[PDB]
Amino acid sequence: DASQFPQLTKEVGKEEAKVVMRTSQGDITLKLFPKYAPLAVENFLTHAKKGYYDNLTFHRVINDFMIQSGDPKGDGTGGESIWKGKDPKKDAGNGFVNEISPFLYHIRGALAMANAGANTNGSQFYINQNKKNQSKGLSSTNYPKPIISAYEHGGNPSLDGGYTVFGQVIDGMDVVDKIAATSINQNDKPEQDITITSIDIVKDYRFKN
């Protein structure tokens, strides 16, 4: 049943959040999945609300792979969770735990947390942009049928189980593709720093202790 996999519908469910990530290349609308990755969703929404991501660059842009942002240092070495130095129950100093779900996958459009090892989630996030038909390459036995089908349109299945997925692009995939396109023949294109202008929380979500 495709309804068990919330990335397969653009409709924002009762227990889903919604944001608009305004970028120098256009607006990307994402829904988030606090039911399955509550730490990554709270971390991202809280940083977004406080302006932590404002004017940050997409510091990694790799065509047919993913686009990545959320590093105040702009080179992949920085960023921290909202709990670093504040709540050791959530972040002991090196980041928060991965949140792997059998309902969420690195299909094209998936929003995920970057990490420097399992359970080192800070503030860096990436959007899966790959467009390769990944269906045949999958170990079918280990993937739900609806997800094998969805992987026809692209994704990074090698990342499944290793990184938290916590959202999905529901509008503006063309913007994600335009950002990714800047890595193609970059030797013949003008220098360009792509930035997040702001993140508008359309439908917030909050968490209980």
Numbering used by the authors: 60 to 268
The authors write:
Here, we solved the protein structures of two secreted parvulin and two secreted cyclophilin-like peptidyl-prolyl isomerase (PPIase) ATP-independent chaperones found in gram-positive streptococcal species. Two types of ATP-independent extracellular PPIases exist in pathogenic streptococci: the parvulin and cyclophilin families. Unlike cytoplasmic PPIases, extracellular PPIases have canonical secretion signal peptides that allow for their translocation across the cell membrane via the Sec pathway.
We then solved the crystal structures of SlrA homologs from S. pneumoniae (SpnSlrA) and S. pyogenes (SpyPpiA) to 1.88 Å and 1.28 Å resolution, respectively, using single-wavelength anomalous diffraction (SAD) data from selenomethionine derivatized crystals. Although the expression construct encodes residues 21–268, three residues of the purification tag and 39 N-terminal residues were disordered in the crystal; thus, only residues 60–268 could be resolved. Superimposition of chains A from the SpnSlrA and SpyPpiA structures confirms that their structures are homologous and share good alignment with an r.m.s.d. of 2.08 Å. The SpnSlrA and SpyPpiA proteins have a canonical cyclophilin fold comprised of eight antiparallel β-strands (SpnSlrA: β1, 72–81; β2, 82–90; β3, 112–120; β4, 121–127; β5, 166–173; β6, 181–188; β7, 221–227; β8, 250–260) that form a β-barrel with two α-helices (SpnSlrA: α1,95–108; α2, 230–240) located at the top and the bottom of the barrel. Thus, we sought to determine whether these substitutions still allow for SpyPpiA PPiase activity. However, we observed ~20% decrease in PPIase activity of SpnSlrA and SpyPpiA compared to hCpyA.
